[PDB]
Every structure is written in C-alpha cells, then in structure tokens.
C-alpha cells in the first residue's frame, strides 16, 4: 500500500447564501479577483495559485 | 497497490444561493475575474491557476 | 494495481440559484471573466488554467 | 491493472436556476468570457484552458 | 488491463433553467464568449480550450 | 376591470433530469402514485386533487 | 380594478437533478405518494389536496 | 384598486440536486408521503393540504 | 388601494443538495411524511396543513 | 392605503446541504414527520399547521 485511500485538495459540504444590493467593481490598469468559492486543486509538480492577482 | 482509491482535486455537495440588484463591473486596461464557484483541477506536471488575474 | 480507482478533477452534487436585476459588464482594452461554475479539468502534462484573465 | 477505473475531468449532478432582468455586456478592443457552466476537460499532453480571456 | 474502464472528460446529469428579459451583447474590435454549458473534451496530444476569448 | 390579467394554477420554466437503475413498484390491495411533475389545475367550484392516493 | 394582475398558485424557474440506484416501493393494503414536483393548483371553492395519502 | 398585483401561493427560483443509493419504502396498512418539492396552492374557500398522510 | 402589492405564502431562491446512501422507510398501521421542500400555500378561509401526519 | 405592500408568510434565500449514510425511519401505529424545509403558509381564517404529527 503506497499513496492509497488518501484525500487531497478536496472541498465538500459547503452551503453559501449571499444577498447584496448594488455590488460594484471598477478597475483601471489593475487586476481584481472577487467571489472565489468551493475551489479545490492538487498539483504533483509546479506551482498552483487560487485567487491570485498581479498588476502591471 | 500504488496511487489507488485516492481522491484529488474533488469538490462535492455545495449549494449556493445569490440574490443581487444592479451588480456591475467596469474595466479599462485591466483584468477582472469574478464569481468562480465549484471548480476542481489536478495537474500531474506544470502549474495550475484558478481565478488568477494579471494586468498589462 | 497502479493509478486505479482514483477520482481526480471531479465536481459533483452542486445546486446553484442566482437572482439578479440589471447585471452589467463594460470592458475597454481589458480581459473580464465572470460566472464560471461546476468546471473540472485534469492535465497529465502542461499547465491548466480555469477562470484566468490577462490584459494587453 | 494500470490506469483503470479512474474518473478524471468529470462533472455530474449539477442543477442551476438563473433569473436576470436586463443582463448586458459591452466590449471595445477587449476579451470577455461569461456564463461557463458544467464543463469538464482532460488533456494527456499540452495545456488546457477553461474560461480564460486575453486582451490585445 | 491498461487504460480500461476509465471515464475522462465526461459531463452528465445537469439540469439548467434560465429566465432573462432584454439580454444584450455589443462588441467592437473584441472577442466575447457567453453561455457555454454541458461541454466535455479529451485531447490525447495538443492543447484544448473551452470558452477562451482573445482580442486583436 | 374584474378578474382580468390574473395568472392562476400556472407552472412554467421547469427542467428535470432523472437517472435511475432498477426502479421498482409492487402493490397488493393498495393505491400508489409516483412521479407526478409539472401539473397545474384550477377549479372554480368543487375539490381538486393532485397526486392523492386512497387504499380500500 | 378588482382581483386583477394577481398571481396565485404559480410555480416557476425550478431545476431538479435526481440520481438513484435501486429505488424501490412495496405497499400492502396501503396508500403511498412519492416524487410530486412542480405542481400548482388554485380552487375558488372546495378543498384542494396535493400529495395527500389515506389508508383503508 | 382591490386585491390587485398580489402574489399568493407562489414558489420560484428553486434548484435541487438529490443523489441516493438504494432508496426504499415499505408500507403495510399505512399512508406514506415522500419527496414533495416546489408545490404551491391557493384556496379561496375550504381547506388545502400539502403532503398530509392519514392511516386507517 | 386595499390588499394590493402584498406577497403572501411565497417561497423563492432556495437551493438544496442531498446526498444519502441506503435511505429507508418502514411503516405498519402508521402515517409517515418525509422530504417536503419549497412548498407555499395561502387559504382565504378554512384550515391549511403542510407536512401533517395522523395515525389511525 | 390598507393592507398594501405587506410581505407575510414568505421564506427566501435559503441554501441547504445534507450528507447522510443509512438514514432510517420505522413506525408502528404512529405518526412521524421528518425533513420539512423552506415551507411558507398564510391563512386569513382557520388554523394552519406545518410539520405537526398526532398518533392514534
């Protein structure tokens, strides 16, 4: 048995309610990331980024 | 048994309710990412990005 | 047994309700990504991107 | 047994309701991606992109 | 047994209801992708893109 | 204007997916009702029943 | 204006996904009601029953 | 203006996902009601019952 | 203006995910009600019951 | 203005996730009510009961 029955990068059983009035975004020459939910990633090699923002 | 029965990059059982009035976005010369939900990725090699924004 | 019975990059059992009035987007010289839901990817080699925006 | 019975890049059991009044998009010299749902991809080699937007 | 009984790039059991009044798109010199649903792809070699928009 | 422009007993915009393996029913001396979907009724006078089961 | 523009007994915008393996029912001398979905009724006079079961 | 523009007994914007393995029911001399979803009723006069079970 | 623009007995914007293995019911000489969701009723006169069970 | 713009017996914006293994019910000569969710009722006259169980 090697690397077996493992759970990795798993999201389960999440319930979300959002109520908003007049949500707004306004970006000039910029990076904006908003609202990421319930995201799971596994990367055997290399670099993994969730919700990452870089300007210029 | 090698690498067997593993669960990796899995999202399950997520319930979402969103109520909004007048949601708006406005981008000039910019990268905007919004609303990602329930996304799962696995990458054996290389780099995996979820909801990542770069300007210019 | 090698690499068998594994679940990878899988999304299941997601229920979403969205109510909006006057949703708007307005982009000049820009990349906008919005509303991604329930997306799963696996990449044996190379780089996999979900909901990723680059300007210029 | 090698690489057998595996589930990879699979999306199942997703129910979505969307109600909108006056949804709008307006793009000049720009890339906009909106509304991706229930999309699954596997790539043995090379790079796979879901909902990815590049300007210019 | 090699590469047998595997499920890859599969989407199943998705139910969608959309109600909209006055949906609009307006693009000048731009790429817009909207409304992709229930799409599955597998690529043994090369790069596979779902819902990807590039301007100019 | 009396009783005008009213909407009553109306069902609209419903999408259903059902997947089953080996569904079964077995009734002796009994009433069974199963699977009613998308049914609308209006009755000006008298009693209206949807999916109602009585034994003996 | 009397009783005008009213909405009564209306169901709209419902999306349902059901996955089952080996669903079963077994009734002796009994009333069973199962699976009612998306049903709307209005009754000006008298009694209206949805999904109601009586034995003997 | 009397009784106008009212909304009564209305269900809207509901999304449901159910996953089950081996669901079962077994009734002897009994009333069972199960699974009612998204049901709306209005009754000007008399008594209205949703999902109501009586034995004998 | 009398009784106008009122909202009564209305359910909206509800998202539900259920995962079960081996759900079971077993009733002898009894009334069982299970799983009611998203049900709305209005009754001008008389008595209205949702999910109500009486034995014998 | 009398009885106008009132909201009464209204349920909105509820998101629920349930995960269960081996849920069971077993009733002899009894009334059981289980799982009521998101139910709204208004009754101008008479008595309204939600999720109410009486034996014998």
Measured in angstroms, the CA of B49 and the nearest CA of chain A are apart by 5
* Contact (Cβ atoms closer than 8 angstroms) between residue J10 and residue I6: no
Interface size between C and E, measured as CB pairs under 8 A: 6
Instruction: Give the separation between CA G35 and CA G20, rounded to whole angstroms.
Output: 12
The answer to whether the Cβ–Cβ distance between I18 and J13 falls below 8 Å is no
Pairwise CB contact (< 8 Å): H47 & J42: no
List the beta bridge partners of residue F15.
G15
Distance CA F10, CA G40 (A): 6
Q: How far apart are CA C50 and CA E9, in angstroms?
A: 15
Closest CA to C43 of A41, J28, B46, B39: B46
A2 is known to lie in a ligand binding site:
no
Best of G30, G44, G46, G56 to disrupt the F interface (most F CBs within 10 Å) is G30
Grouping H, G, I as helix, E, B as strand and the rest as coil, residue J25 is coil
d(C-alpha B23, C-alpha J13), whole Å: 17
Tell me if H17 and D14 make a contact (CB, 8 A cut-off): yes
Cα atoms in the Cβ-side hemisphere of radius 13 Å centred on A27: 33
Within 10 Å of residue F56's Cβ, how many Cβ atoms? 13
Answer whether D38's CB lies under 8 Å from E14's CB.
yes
Return all residues near F32 (Cβ < 8 A) that are at least 6 apart: F25, F53, G25, G27, G31, G32, G33, G34
State the pairing for strand pair G15-21/H15-21: parallel
User: Is C2 within 8 Å of chain A by CB?
Assistant: no
Cα D23 to Cα B22: distance, rounded to the nearest angstrom: 10
Q: How far is CA B16 from CA B21, E3, G10, G56, in A?
A: 17, 36, 24, 43
For chain B, the straight-line distance linking the first and the last C-alpha, in angstroms and rounded, comes to 48
B17 neighbourhood in chain J, CB within 8 Å: 13-15
Q: Tell me the C-alpha to C-alpha distance, in Å, between residue J4 and each of A49, H4, H5, I4.
A: 52, 10, 10, 5
Q: Are A6 and B9 in contact (CB under 8 A)?
A: no
> For residue F40, which of H44, H46, G9 has the smallest C-alpha distance?
G9
The whole-angstrom distance between H10's CA and the closest CA on chain I is: 5
Contact J31, I28 (CB under 8 A): no
Cα–Cα distance measured from residue E24 to residue E28, given in angstroms and rounded to the nearest whole number: 14
Q: Testing the interface with H: which of J31, J45, J47, J51 to mutate, by most H Cβ within 10 A?
A: J31
Contacts of A30 (CB under 8 A, 6+ apart): A55, B30, B55
- Measured between alpha carbons, how far is B50 from B42 in angstroms, rounded to an integer? 11
- Whether I13 and chain C come into contact, CB under 8 Å, resolves to yes
Inter-chain CB proximity D47 and B46 less than 8 Å: yes
Q: Cα angle at E13 between A17 and I15, to 5 degrees?
A: 15
Experimental technique, in short, is: cryo-EM
- Burial class, J27, CB count within 10 angstroms (exposed 0-12 / middle 13-18 / buried 19+): buried
């Amino acid at each position: 048995y090697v690397g077996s029955k493992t759970k990795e990068g798993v999201v389960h059983g999440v319930a979300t309610v959002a109520e908003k009035t007049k949500e707004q975004v306004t970006n000039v020459g910029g990076a904006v990331v908003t609202g990421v939910t319930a995201v799971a990633q596994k990367t055997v090699e290399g670099a993994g980024s969730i919700a990452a923002a870089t300007g210029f």
